């Protein structure tokens, strides 16, 4: 029966729309089934499903893996179908999807390994001489894949034969293209075969056909690019023809030869690199005036590549290269040309990285004032890149004056709010530093004019500039009209746009975070009451900046505000600890710490205990976090007595709250807890003796956090004492209690050591009851997976019996 095997090899649907377990099961079984099914039916059905027009990506991946596995087994039976498979999968190699290309190359590789080299060559040879250019490309890529799979020396004879063919130029072209695709695909793995490939393809540079010469030059360029920074004694028979050709050719072939020269030059020594550069340089200078916007890109790439070597020195560059470069490439025509714009910027930056920043920066800085703003943005980009890569050591009085005037005029002449002018202004002022004293009045006037009005998109950019430049602004003992700016920023506190309000708050914070409260002219007592209603705003930037500002005020100017308002502000901040953005929570923690450090722990702790007594779950958790924060900023010696006095209250759900607070407190303070373990030990004893399940579960959680908090600090006495009370709970059936007990045991494994844990497990490891054995082997496996190595020194001695030897004799040696 024929459709017998078809109906049973619907295994591929078993896999396609199927579960992962049956996926792998059907995979293995169809792998065992392949040799008997036969390649005929298998491929006859799978290649349509792989040719499906709307198949998925991972369905394709699984199909490719199926092909790989069914191809490995049936090795020499795939020959009569190879051709067919290729016509299906010789595409997918020029596909715009990268993973499609990877999958096609993997399929062709496994096919070439399954079949032989002679079969692949015999099926692929007729399409070598085809006239359709679409076939000669897939053929070359497939030959490259076969060479990568079966090796280069296995294909070297066919290559040497095909590009010597006197029958047609198409075969020679396709052979050289095969060498080029091999280089492109394999990269730096061609280095042992570089000379073989070069001698195979070298005779094409002097062919009578112009297409053969071009493809030979492209193949040489590909090999030289794959070989870099090695490979140069293999490129020796090409130096004479390539340079004679750049001296005689003109056009497309000249461009190919020049690309080859440019990829070959960085492989030479100083002599040859220096000597060869002169020749190609006179040719390139001549070619500076040719037409195609491809030629300009190639010329720029070659200039950048050659000017980055050691054989070329700054003297020759500034003497011969810079005048024509800056005369021919720096015009706004280059600016509206979006294709080569980035190339020009990178080439200019990498030129300045060798010749020196001053010359480049001058030659383009005179051009910062221009009628076209595209040419302005280009110069600004190049200038700030050079400045960031080199800094500005060589700025002169004249150059400093020109820079400042130019950046000021560029700031005001701005249509749309851009980050380019902002970053340029910022980095220029930050690199000048304490040197810009009078342009500080000038810049302050400019930012005052920009911040005064105009739609708040200019105002928020001015606020960003203030935020990023206030350091150097005050760095020169000029704050005063600093206060003039702060007054205006204060008046700009009612804004309907939250984005502009964020920048305003950032600028105000950057100011006050460097302006002393004594001399911060707006009285702190007036500001803060204007500031406290903004804390209820719902924008994230506004909230974060407001909290940071109130925190700074409470940290430094605590004296002016009458307390009570600080208490209200902290009680309001309590609700921000649940914020779903880490930033908000981080700033809230910081500000709460500052306010607690300011007003004192006593009153806030009393209020926090009252709040912990009466509220719902989330607010009580936030109160616990707040108590831990207060106890960390003001030493826990100020919080622990008042918290332990609250445990003396006779009510349930009251002691459990105290236990949850102690748990989170120890987890939050970590190492600081080493001085407070003796104080909470009797309470944990009592709770461990408490009948309530939560009391023991929470006490176990406390033990775990305390154990992992103190580690390496010598607190083993109390921890062993507490283990003596934790251990009897191992026979507990409730899942939460036993989970907490396991957590506490694994914390004590770290704090107390694995030797004690093994000592607690030894007598139960082999108990007669299966319950005891289950529990003890779970604990033992947990102890064994962590610190398997230490247990070597702790195992007890076990005596030999009649049948087996159990003593470890090496440890009994005595030197």
């Amino acid at each position: 029966e024929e459709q017998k095997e078809r109906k049973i090899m619907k295994l591929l649907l078993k896999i396609k729309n199927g579960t992962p377990p049956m996926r792998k099961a059907a995979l293995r079984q169809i792998t065992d089934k392949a040799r008997e099914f036969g390649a005929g039916p298998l491929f006859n059905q799978i290649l349509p499903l792989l040719m499906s027009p709307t198949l998925e990506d991972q369905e394709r991946h699984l199909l490719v893996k199926v092909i790989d596995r069914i191809l490995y087994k049936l090795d020499d039976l795939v020959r009569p179908y190879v051709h067919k498979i290729l016509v299906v999968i010789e595409p997918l190699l020029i596909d715009e999807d990268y993973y499609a290309r990877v999958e096609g190359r993997e399929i062709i590789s496994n096919l070439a390994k399954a079949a032989g080299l002679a079969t692949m060559i015999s099926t692929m040879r007729p399409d070598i001489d085809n006239m359709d250019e679409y076939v000669r490309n897939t053929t070359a890529r497939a030959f490259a894949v076969v060479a990568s799979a079966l090796g280069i020396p296995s294909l070297l004879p066919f290559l040497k034969a095909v590009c010597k063919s006197k029958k047609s130029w198409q075969a020679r072209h396709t052979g050289i293209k095969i060498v080029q695709q091999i280089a492109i695909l394999m990269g730096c793995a061609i280095l042992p075969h570089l000379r073989s490939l070069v001698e195979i393809i070298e005779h094409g540079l002097v062919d009578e056909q112009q297409k053969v010469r071009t493809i030979s030059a492209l193949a040489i360029a590909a090999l030289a690019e794959a070989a870099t920074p090695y490979g140069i004694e293999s490129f020796d028979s090409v130096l004479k023809p390539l340079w004679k050709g750049i001296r005689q050719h003109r056009g497309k072939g000249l461009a190919a030869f020049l690309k080859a020269i440019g990829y070959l030059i960085p492989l030479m020594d100083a002599e040859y690199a220096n000597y060869y550069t002169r020749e190609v340089m006179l040719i390139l200078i001549r070619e500076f005036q040719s037409p195609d916007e491809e030629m300009k890109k190639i010329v720029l790439k070659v200039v950048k590549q050659c000017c980055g070597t050691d054989g070329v020195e700054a003297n020759y560059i500034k003497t011969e290269i810079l005048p024509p470069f800056f005369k021919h490439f720096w015009q706004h025509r280059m600016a509206l040309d979006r294709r080569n714009y980035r190339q020009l910027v990178d080439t200019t930056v990498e030129l300045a990285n060798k010749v020196g920043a001053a010359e480049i920066i001058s030659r383009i800085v005179d051009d910062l004032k221009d009628e076209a703003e595209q040419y302005r943005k280009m110069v600004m980009e190049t200038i700030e890149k050079i400045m960031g890569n080199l800094g500005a050591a060589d700025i002169d009085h004249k150059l400093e004056e020109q820079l400042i005037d130019g950046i000021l005029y560029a700031f005001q002449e701005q249509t749309t709010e851009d980050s380019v002018m902002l970053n340029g202004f910022g980095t220029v002022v930050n690199a000048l530093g304490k040197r810009v004293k009078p342009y500080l009045p000038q810049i302050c006037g400019t930012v005052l004019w920009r911040l005064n009005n105009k739609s708040a998109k200019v105002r928020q950019q001015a606020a960003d500039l203030i935020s990023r430049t206030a350091v150097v602004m005050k760095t020169c003992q000029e704050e005063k009209l600093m206060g003039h700016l702060g007054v205006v920023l204060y008046e700009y506190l009612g804004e309907e746009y939250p984005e502009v309000l964020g920048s305003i708050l950032g600028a105000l914070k950057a100011i006050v975070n460097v302006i002393g409260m004594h001399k911060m002219t707006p009285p702190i007592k007036d500001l803060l009451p204007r500031l406290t209603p903004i804390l209820k705003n719902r924008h994230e930037k506004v909230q974060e900046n407001c909290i940071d500002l109130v925190g700074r005020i409470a940290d430094r100017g605590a004296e002016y505000v009458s307390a009570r308002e600080w208490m209200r502000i902290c009680f309001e901040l309590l609700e921000l600890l649940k914020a779903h953005k880490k930033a908000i929570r981080r700033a809230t923690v910081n500000t709460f710490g500052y306010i607690a450090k300011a007003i004192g722990p006593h009153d806030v702790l009393a209020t926090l205990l009252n709040n912990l007594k009466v509220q719902e779950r989330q607010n009580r958790v936030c109160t616990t976090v707040a108590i831990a924060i207060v106890a960390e900023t003001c030493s826990p010696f100020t919080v622990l007595p008042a918290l332990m006095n609250e445990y003396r209250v006779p009510e349930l759900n009251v002691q459990n709250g105290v236990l949850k607070s102690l748990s989170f407190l120890f987890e939050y303070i970590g190492e600081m807890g080493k001085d407070y373990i003796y104080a909470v030990t009797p309470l944990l004893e009592d709770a461990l003796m408490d009948r309530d399940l939560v009391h023991r579960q929470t006490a176990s959680a406390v033990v775990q956090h305390m154990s992992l908090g103190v580690y390496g600090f010598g607190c083993e006495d109390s921890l062993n004492h507490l283990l003596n009370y934790v251990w009897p709970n191992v026979f507990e059936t409730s899942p939460h209690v036993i989970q907490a007990v396991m957590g506490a045991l694994e914390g004590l494994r770290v704090a107390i050591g694995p030797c004690r844990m093994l000592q607690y497990c030894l007598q139960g490891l082999f108990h007669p009851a299966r319950k005891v054995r289950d529990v003890y082997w779970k604990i033992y496996n947990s102890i064994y997976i962590g610190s398997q190595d230490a247990l070597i020194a702790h195992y007890p001695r076990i005596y030999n019996d009649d049948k087996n030897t159990y003593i470890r004799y090496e440890l009994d040696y005595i030197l």
Partner: protein, 66 residues
């Protein structure tokens, strides 16, 4: 269960003891100064002690029961 050397409620004495003998021999091979101690104690080259431990790795504690 996937880790070699773990046990369960049906583990016997023999499996436990051969597991600890095997990882004892591996620990001896790993630590440089334990092998020094043994090679000084029994007056052998360290390569010989290593080879002896590897040979003992196969059947420590004798063949199993029944």
């Amino acid at each position: 269960s996937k880790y070699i050397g773990t046990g369960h409620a049906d583990t016997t004495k023999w499996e436990w003891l051969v597991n600890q003998h095997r990882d004892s021999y591996c620990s001896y091979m790993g630590h440089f100064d334990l092998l020094n101690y043994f090679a000084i104690a029994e007056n052998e080259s360290k390569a010989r002690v290593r080879f002896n431990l590897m040979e003992k790795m196969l059947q420590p504690c004798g063949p199993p029961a029944d």
